[PDB]
A paper describes a structure:
In purple photosynthetic bacteria, photons are absorbed by the photosynthetic reaction centre (RC), which is closely related to Photosystem II but lacks an oxygen-evolving complex. The RC from Blastochloris viridis (RC vir ) was the first membrane-protein structure to be solved by X-ray crystallography and has been extensively used as a model protein for studying the light-driven charge-transfer reactions of photosynthesis. Subunits L and M of RC vir each contain five transmembrane helices that form a heterodimer supporting four bacteriochlorophyll cofactors, two pheophytins, a nonhaem iron and a tightly bound menaquinone arranged about an axis of twofold pseudosymmetry. The transmembrane domain of RC vir is capped on the periplasmic side by the single transmembrane helix-containing subunit H and is capped on the cytoplasmic side by the cytochrome subunit C, which contains four haem cofactors.
LCP microcrystals diffracted to 2.25 Å resolution when exposed to XFEL radiation, which is an improvement of 0.15 Å over previous microcrystal forms. A second set of data was also collected at the SwissFEL in Switzerland in October 2019. By collecting significantly more data, 160 000 images could be indexed and the resolution was improved to 2.25 Å. The unit cell (a = 84.7, b = 125.1, c = 182.4 Å) is very similar to the SACLA RC vir structure and clusters with it in the internal distance-matrix analysis. In the XFEL structures reported here, electron density in these regions is modelled either by an LDAO or a monoolein molecule, but the occupancy is lower than for the vapour-diffusion crystal structure and one of the LDAOs in that structure is not visible at all. As in our vapour-diffusion microcrystals, the number of visible lipids increases with the resolution, and the 2.25 Å resolution structure is modelled with five extra detergent molecules and 23 extra water molecules when compared with the 2.4 Å resolution structure. In the 2.25 Å resolution structure QA could be modelled with an additional carbon in the tail of the molecule and the lipid crystal contacts between the two M subunits are more defined. Moreover, the diacyl glycerol molecule which is fused to the C-terminus of the C subunit also has poor electron density for its dual acyl tails, and only one of them is modelled in the 2.25 Å resolution structure as the remaining atoms are undefined. We therefore incorporate ubiquinone 1 (UQ1) and ubiquinone 2 (UQ2) into the crystallization matrix to replace the native ubiquinone 9 that is lost during purification. One potential advantage of crystallizing in LCP is the possibility of adding ubiquinone to the crystallization setup, as it easily mixes into monoolein.
Residue numbers in the entry:
A (entry chain LLL): 1 to 273
B (entry chain CCC): 1 to 332
C (entry chain HHH): 1 to 45, 58 to 258
D (entry chain MMM): 1 to 323
The structure:
């Protein structure tokens, strides 16, 4: 149940809490304190989903939807059926995600590698907090958060967009979408380039770093380099949400009109009006 | 380029659908102050005497009123429409029955029109109704009217720039944009949907699968119809100072039942009302108005949603004078 | 009402829906997951879903077949403390020198990584005389190397440049109180204007940095040995680094 | 902290490397020049660039398309240069507003749009030959060209194939900043909410997946840069501790792992499937599905919600209702 090269890496150490007590594996999975922590919040969360589902109409997993409370309840607590389940499940989700991130730190430390992955994984946790915690706080109600259902969450995104008439004109969104597109393209390019060098076809020889740099210098007149494309990729992916967050938070608390009208700052300058 | 919190929020759909209004309190406050200028009703008067239909010589609409009531209607009408020029805006002092001044014949048609809103379009105006003031706001020219081409500013009491003037061809895209809530949509929804009843606002098929005989080549409506409907909805939204979720669950714009709010059904009646006003009362006044009031195609100024609403979901925040002025309707 | 009826009139979009899921699960389970198992499989301490070994034709002659049969040589340097498969293993000696846990190197080939035109790729600036430090950056030659304990451990003698990518990958330093140089990867180096800070290991541990067979070139296995030593230090330079932080 | 994962502390300079290809060596133009500031976060060298016929053909065809677009945009503000700069984002070149079916539209109502599209397509096709042929010239696989081909196929679907299949040029995407964006809503509305198109779902899953995968992969390689993880080619042919540690990090976290080669196949597949899934969705739209929301209702896949404000009957359906 070990990879051929794995045994030599399976030493004690690198935990943040508990020392030797949780320093072990179940099959391929490292445990650690944050492993135990994660499994607690996951077990609690999935149970509350099951309990909520049992009170609702259906057992169809694609129709299940645990929704936040009506706006009336503000930042207060709500009856379980009427949004309380939603509040409990959000706390378990945060618990599970933060546990998962800190478990990645323990694994990083045991292997003596950089902490870059758990750091990168903080970006989507932040964005979840912007949608479910920071934005609802600034508007004064948990009711502004998105519901936990596979299809119902799309209806929330849809209505949220159309509350600002045309969400495409949101400057934070324009940035976010630009990073999503260039990131998807760059992964294609990076993945394609590596495969092109290691698999040239027809029992021909594997090529070189020099071939990689030459290919892109020929095609676009620049090659960023092998290390730098990995740093760039983390940059492009991360900025999908780091720029997006400002467009989401701005919508309601810092802007109440349609997003097209925002561009009035430019269009309505007196000297060309 | 930003509006400081807090924001006022309402809920128009099931919790978790992100449906409802988003309002800046300073903006709501400024519109409330503007609309608080609605003059108060004049003191009620006892119906003492005979009907003016056999006292005065040229009363074709308000003939049932007694002298004291009729003079009250005339004092209200004057406050609402021409408070600066007074009774002589419409009247020759030497003969109060003279139709010699152009505003007189127009005022009569406007009494007919106001009574028809309050009687035939209750599905839209309910028991709030309208007075002259709803549209006119104390000036003979109502501040928010439409010609058969887009004009800026929206408020005709504001002075146009060189580029806003309809004659400057280079400002056309901006005249269109500021009528569609700053969108780039390349359609005039007033001329297309509100001037008359030629075009259908609905574009979304009511079948899952494409119906044979309306779905290929020249039998299909062009995509431009979807854009145009979108432009009407941007215009209607800005005119009422609201967003799509006031009327729709965006899940299905085309669906009624739980997928639409009662305000959407009222908006539907509003579209029919505006078309009636324009086709049967406002467009035909080009024969009765001076050249200085007409557009470049010889059209009379006409009404859209903003003419009454002026950026509020209910005109003047629901202020009524219906029970104060029953002669403006309804009329059984 | 009929037993076995579903409330579903079939249309082409419905057909293409099932087809798409089929294509996705086929590519993921039967191709991508098969490619994922080319290294470290078969498992030790199942076979029917492994692909046939892949052969690469190398740039400078020869072939390699993956997975390589080269065995793992650190087996006796760790002991099964406990009967439970999941329990961590105990080092038998100094894990930093024995090269286990985060001090582990891979059984990489004892060949000099080469440029496209057959020269050694990673060489000191005393050999690559056509290479320089860019105008504006710190020439670290002559500067002291400060270890974790604040002690000066040696002096920088050279930089090793990657001739293929035009990128410095190692510093060479004279080790104070020995006749030897050591390599350190730039990744373990804080380059200040008046010193190189190394938090990875204590000053005394620069003595046992793996030695190069040759003075002016390095093999792929040697690169791994040098790099792994410093990473070993993150957990083993002091006894309290292997212990939990909080 | 590995400061090298943030920037290059000490930059190297050396002689300009050139790898010879089977053809085209003489079509490389420019003197390479180095940028100290670029060299902090990437390679310092800018240029030279390969020209060739496909390069020049692409630039010529592309420029024609841009010129046609810019001239129609200048026409829309009647060649006032200050209004042009002001209104730029709002300006566009539109497909036909009227229904001419597949009839070639007149210049004033879609003909220019159709010409701009033809030149854009010939530009893309030329650039594809460049991306493919440069790979073959250097003895590299054509993986990039096939990823690029899926991207081009998607542009052909929204620009040309969908309009052809339903038989109207009116359905094409306008040229312009705001106008190309406005099309997204007009199209979603016409076809009953793209959230309810399963191929929109797939395409988004793969796009979000590209974010997850490049963040994870980018972060993983920086995490093992100390061990030369960035030298991905020789880690494929000769597994080092870099990719052993990378594999075990993921195996211990999620319970399974890729190889340094196979993770690039995951990346390439996810990227490709954004464009393939999107293309299938457009091909089905209007041809075989008119309203995605009602299609989901028909297959029992659309959620329902309680009333909050009262259910509102369609006024058009009431007895005595006007048209
Ligand atoms: C009508 C509605 C519109 C709309 C409304 C909209 C809104 C309201 C918001 C966006 C946002 C965004 N939109 Mg957008 N949109 C986008 C693209 C995007 C995204 C790039 C961006 C960020 C998404 C996000 O927050 O994920 C969030 C994902 C998260 C937080 C995932 C967290 C993962 C978690 C940590 C881990 C969970 C683990 C699992 C539970 C584990 C399961 C266990 C299993 C696996 C074993 C495109 C490309 C388009 C196109 C082509 O038109 C578009 C159109 C529209 N959007 C419409 C115009 N959009 C967001 C944004 O940034 O706007 C500025 C945003 O708030
Ligand atoms: C601001 C905008 C948002 C948005 C807008 C959005 C759109 C527009 C679309 C989706 C879609 C999806 N979203 Mg959603 N979303 C989802 C999850 C999902 C999936 C059900 C699906 C595919 C995502 C994917 O492949 O990503 C990449 C990740 C990959 C490839 C790794 C595998 C992830 C795995 C498939 C996730 C499975 C989640 C579980 C079913 C739920 C949790 C299970 C628990 C109870 C054990 C989560 C878990 C979250 C959280 C926790 O924040 C989230 C937040 C948001 N989404 C924001 C609210 N999302 C698509 C869909 O088809 O929905 C029907 C879709 O079209
Ligand atoms: C209200 C409107 C909506 C909408 C309408 C919409 C439509 C109409 C379509 C999409 C499509 C898609 N949407 Mg979607 N959308 C998306 C995400 C996405 C994309 C993943 C996907 C594919 C498009 C793409 O990658 O283009 C980016 C990549 C492109 C365009 C490839 C370009 C390649 C080309 C070779 C580049 C050439 C460059 C040259 C240099 C150019 C030179 C030009 C010169 C000469 C003039 C998200 C994440 C959300 C959220 C979070 O809400 C969302 C909401 C919405 N979308 C709303 C529901 N969306 C597409 C799809 O999947 O449909 C099924 C699509 O057709
Ligand atoms: C810009 C940066 C990008 C980014 C980056 C990274 N992403 C990472 C990492 C990095 C670096 C990791 O290192 C980590 C990982 O391990 O990789 C394999 C990870 C992961 N990214 C996942 C999902 C994911 N990433 C998304 C987005 C981005 N990622 C953006 C694009 C999206 C969407 C929607 O886009 C999804 C769905 C998981 C697979 C995994 C966490 C598992 C977990 O935390 O387990 C712990 C938790 C569970 C196993 C279940 C918890 C169940 C709770 C308690 C109850 C239900 C909660 C409720 C919210 C349900 C609502 C459902 C409803 C909406 C339908
Ligand atoms: C999921 C798959 C993704 C994907 C994939 C892939 N995408 C690729 C490839 C792959 C595999 C390539 O192999 C190829 C390439 O070469 O990569 C370096 C390429 C391309 N993707 C570009 C743009 C893009 N991809 C987008 C989207 C996705 N891509 C999706 C997300 C989007 C969005 C989101 O809107 C945009 C804007 C161009 C840079 C390039 C075409 C150049 C061209 O066809 O020129 C033809 C036109 C000209 C040469 C015009 C002349 C120039 C004038 C003066 C105006 C300047 C314009 C300038 C931008 C042109 C660049 C020239 C310069 C380099 C000297
Ligand atoms: C004995 C036994 C087997 C028991 C099992 C029973 C069981 C289920 C649980 C045990 C019970 C206990 C006590 C548990 C404690 C341990 C514990 C905390 C377990 C957690 C269980 C759990 C929650 C599991 C779910 C894990 C999870 C979040 C999985 C999601 C997988 C998904 C969807 C991934 C998305 C990303 C994706 C598409 C990846 C595919 C490609 C891969 C693998 C990329 C990762 C990757 C990258 C990114 C590289 O760059 C790379 C570079 C060089 C080499 C390798 C890699 C590499 O592998
Ligand atoms: C235009 C806005 C008017 C203003 C301002 C005033 N009046 Fe008027 N008046 C107007 C009309 C259209 C009519 C005909 C009404 C109808 O039912 O057809 C009238 C009528 C009169 C009369 C009756 C005169 C007669 O026919 O003999 C009187 C006495 C009268 N109006 C008086 C009056 C006064 C005193 C006003 C200022 C307070 C005033 N009118 C304003 C139109 C308009
Ligand atoms: C909106 C639905 C209106 C209501 C209610 C009333 N009026 Fe009106 N009026 C309206 C328009 C769009 C116009 C055309 C523009 C114009 O200024 O001509 C008018 C016109 C008049 C006029 C002529 C004004 C002029 O040109 O000098 C008069 C005298 C007038 N309207 C009077 C009037 C009265 C008395 C009303 C209540 C009974 C009334 N109007 C209602 C729009 C609307
Ligand atoms: C009430 C004040 C509304 C607001 C705000 C918005 N819409 Fe609307 N919409 C409304 C009505 C009454 C109608 C039907 C008009 C008719 O004559 O039948 C519509 C129609 C649409 C449609 C077309 C639906 C169809 O069946 O084809 C769409 C696509 C639509 N509306 C969208 C939309 C958007 C995006 C809005 C915010 C910008 C919006 N509407 C606002 C009523 C109201
Ligand atoms: C003056 C003649 C009007 C015109 C033109 C339009 N509307 Fe209107 N609207 C008017 C009144 C007097 C009222 C009643 C306010 C009340 O207290 O009942 C309304 C009401 C609405 C509503 C309902 C708002 C709510 O319930 O909060 C909507 C949604 C509405 N109106 C929309 C609407 C549209 C879309 C119009 C143009 C097509 C339009 N109205 C024109 C008066 C007048
Ligand atoms: C069958 C017959 C007879 C003929 C067939 C013709 C044919 C195949 C036509 C095909 C047409 C097609 C595929 C059209 C597609 C159009 C599309 C997808 C347009 C999309 C986006 C347009 C955008 C973003 C336009 C932007 C315009 C500008 C920025 C103005 C140009 C100015 C610049 C400075 C260059 C912009 C470069 C950009 C990357 C920023
Ligand atoms: C080892 O891998 C890689 C390189 O090293 C030799 C590159 O040089 C490039 C090319 C990167 C460039 C031209 C940066 C410009 C921006 C984008 C989005 C491509 C890619 C894709 C890559 O994968
Ligand atoms: C690569 C993983 C992506 C998985 C996301 C799910 C895509 C299929 C969507 C089907 C259900 C959505 N809808 C609304 C069309 O029914
Ligand atoms: Fe890589």
């Amino acid at each position: 149940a070990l990879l051929s090269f794995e045994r030599k890496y399976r030493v004690r150490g690198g935990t943040l809490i508990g020392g030797d007590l949780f320093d072990f594996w179940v099959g391929p999975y490292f445990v650690g304190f944050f492993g135990v922590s994660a499994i607690f919040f996951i077990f609690l969360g999935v149970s509350l989903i099951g309990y909520a589902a049992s009170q609702g109409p259906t057992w169809d997993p694609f129709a299940i939807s645990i929704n936040p409370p009506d706006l009336k309840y503000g930042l207060g607590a709500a009856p379980l059926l009427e949004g309380g389940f939603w509040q409990a499940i959000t706390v378990c989700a945060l618990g599970a995600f933060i546990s998962w991130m800190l478990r990645e730190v323990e694994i990083s430390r045991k292997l003596g590698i950089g902490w870059h992955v758990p750091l990168a994984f903080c970006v989507p946790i932040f964005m979840f907090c912007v949608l479910q915690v920071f934005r609802p706080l600034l508007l004064g109600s948990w009711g502004h958060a998105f519901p936990y259902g596979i299809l119902s969450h799309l209806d929330w995104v849809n209505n949220f967009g159309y509350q600002y008439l045309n969400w495409h004109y949101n400057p934070g969104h324009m940035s976010s979408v630009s990073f999503l597109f260039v990131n998807a393209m760059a992964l294609g390019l990076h993945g394609g380039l590596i495969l092109s060098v290691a698999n040239p076809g027809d029992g021909d020889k594997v090529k070189t770093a020099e071939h990689e740099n030459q290919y892109f210098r020929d095609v676009v007149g620049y090659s960023i380099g092998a290390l730098s494309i990995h740093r760039l990729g983390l940059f492009l992916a991360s900025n999908i949400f780091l720029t997006g967050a400002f467009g989401t938070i701005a919508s309601g608390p810092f802007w109440t009109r349609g997003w097209p009208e925002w561009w009035g700052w430019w269009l309505d300058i007196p000297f060309w009006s | 380029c930003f509006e400081p919190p807090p924001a006022t929020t309402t809920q128009t759909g099931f919790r978790g659908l992100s449906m409802g209004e988003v309002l800046h309190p300073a903006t709501v406050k400024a519109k409330k102050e503007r609309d608080a200028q609605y003059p108060p009703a004049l003191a009620a008067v006892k119906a003492e005497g005979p009907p003016v239909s056999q006292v005065y010589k040229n009363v074709k609409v308000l003939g049932n009123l007694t002298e004291a009531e009729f003079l009250r209607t005339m004092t209200a009408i004057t406050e609402w429409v021409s408070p600066q020029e007074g009774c002589t805006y419409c009247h020759d002092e030497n003969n109060l029955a003279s139709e010699a001044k152009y505003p007189y014949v127009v005022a009569r048609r406007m009494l007919e029109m106001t009574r028809a809103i309050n009687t035939n379009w209750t599905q839209h105006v309910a028991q709030t109704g309208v007075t002259c003031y709803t549209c006119h706001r104390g000036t003979p020219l109502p501040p928010y009217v439409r010609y058969l081409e887009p004009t800026l500013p929206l408020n005709n009491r504001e002075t146009p720039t060189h580029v806003e003037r309809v004659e400057t061809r280079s400002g056309y895209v901006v005249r269109l944009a500021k009528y569609t809530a700053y969108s780039a949509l390349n359609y005039d929804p007033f001329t297309m949907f509100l001037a008359n009843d030629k075009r259908q606002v609905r574009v979304v098929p009511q079948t899952a699968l494409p119906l044979v005989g309306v779905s290929r080549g020249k039998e299909r409506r062009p995509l431009s119809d979807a854009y145009a409907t979108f432009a009407l909805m941007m215009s209607i939204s800005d005119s009422l100072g609201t967003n799509c979720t006031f009327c729709h669950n965006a899940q299905t714009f085309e669906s009624w039942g739980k997928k639409s709010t009662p305000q959407r059904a009222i908006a539907w009646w509003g579209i029919r009302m505006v078309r009636d006003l324009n086709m049967n009362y406002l467009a035909p006044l080009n024969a009765s108005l001076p050249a200085s009031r007409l557009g470049r195609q010889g059209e009379a100024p006409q009404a859209d949603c903003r003419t009454c609403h002026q950026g509020v979901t209910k005109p003047l925040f629901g202020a009524s004078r219906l029970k104060d002025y029953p002669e403006l309707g309804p009329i059984k | 009402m009929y037993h076995g009826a579903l409330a579903q009139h079939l249309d082409i979009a419905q057909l293409v829906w099932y087809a798409q899921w089929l294509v996705i699960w086929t590519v993921v389970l039967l191709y991508l997951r098969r490619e994922d198992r080319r290294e470290g499989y078969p498992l030790v301490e199942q076979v029917y879903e492994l692909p046939y070994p892949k052969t690469f034709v190398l740039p400078h002659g020869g072939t390699v077949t993956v997975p390589r049969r080269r065995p793992e040589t650190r087996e006796l340097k760790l002991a099964q403390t406990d009967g439970f498969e999941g329990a961590p293993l105990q080092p038998t000696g100094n894990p930093l020198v024995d090269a286990v846990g985060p001090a582990s190197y891979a059984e990489r080939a004892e060949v000099v990584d080469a440029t496209v035109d057959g020269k050694a790729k990673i060489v000191p600036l005393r050999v690559a005389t056509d290479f320089s430090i860019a105008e504006g950056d710190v020439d670290p030659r002559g500067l002291p190397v400060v270890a974790a304990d604040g002690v000066e451990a040696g002096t920088v003698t050279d930089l090793w440049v990657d001739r293929s990518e035009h990128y410095f990958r190692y510093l060479e330093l004279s080790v104070a109180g020995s006749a030897r140089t050591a390599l350190i990867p730039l990744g373990f180096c804080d380059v200040k204007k008046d010193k190189i800070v190394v938090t990875s290991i204590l000053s005394e541990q620069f003595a046992n940095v793996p030695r190069l067979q040759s003075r002016d070139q390095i093999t792929l296995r040697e690169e791994d040995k040098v790099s792994a030593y410093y990473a070993g230090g993150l957990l083993y330079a002091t006894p309290e680094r292997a212990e939990s932080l909080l | 902290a590995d400061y090298q994962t943030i920037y290059t502390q000490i930059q190297a300079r050396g002689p300009h490397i050139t790898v010879s290809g089977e053809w085209g060596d003489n079509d490389r133009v420019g003197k390479p020049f180095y940028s100290y500031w670029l060299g902090k976060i990437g390679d310092a060298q800018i240029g030279p660039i390969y020209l060739g016929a496909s390069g020049i053909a692409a630039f010529a065809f592309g420029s024609t398309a841009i010129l046609i677009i810019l001239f129609n945009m200048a026409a829309e503000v009647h060649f006032d240069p200050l209004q042009f700069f002001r209104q730029f984002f709002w300006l566009g070149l539109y497909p036909p507003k009227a229904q001419y079916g597949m009839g070639i539209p007149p210049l004033h109502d879609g003909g220019w749009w159709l010409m701009a599209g033809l030149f854009m397509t010939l530009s893309l096709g030329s650039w594809w030959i460049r991306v493919y042929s440069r790979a073959r010239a250097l003895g590299l696989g054509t993986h990039i060209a096939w990823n690029f081909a899926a991207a081009i196929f998607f542009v052909l679907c929204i620009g040309c194939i969908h309009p052809t299949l339903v038989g109207s040029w009116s359905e094409g995407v306008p040229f312009g900043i705001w106008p190309h964006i406005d099309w997204l809503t007009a199209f979603s509305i016409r076809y009953g909410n793209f959230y309810y198109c399963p191929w929109h779902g797939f395409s988004i899953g793969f796009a979000y997946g590209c974010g997850l995968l490049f963040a994870a992969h980018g972060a993983t390689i920086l995490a093992v840069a100390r061990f030369g993880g960035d030298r991905e080619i020789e880690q494929i042919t000769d597994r080092g501790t870099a990719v052993e540690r990378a594999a075990l990090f993921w195996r211990w976290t999620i319970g399974f792992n890729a190889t340094i080669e196979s993770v690039h196949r995951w990346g390439w597949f996810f990227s490709l499937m954004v464009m393939v899934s999107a293309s299938v969705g457009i091909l089905l739209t209007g041809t075989f599905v008119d309203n995605w929301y009602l299609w989901c209702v028909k297959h029992g896949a659309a959620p329902d919600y309680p009333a909050y404000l009262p259910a509102t009957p369609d006024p058009a359906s009431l007895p005595g209702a006007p048209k």
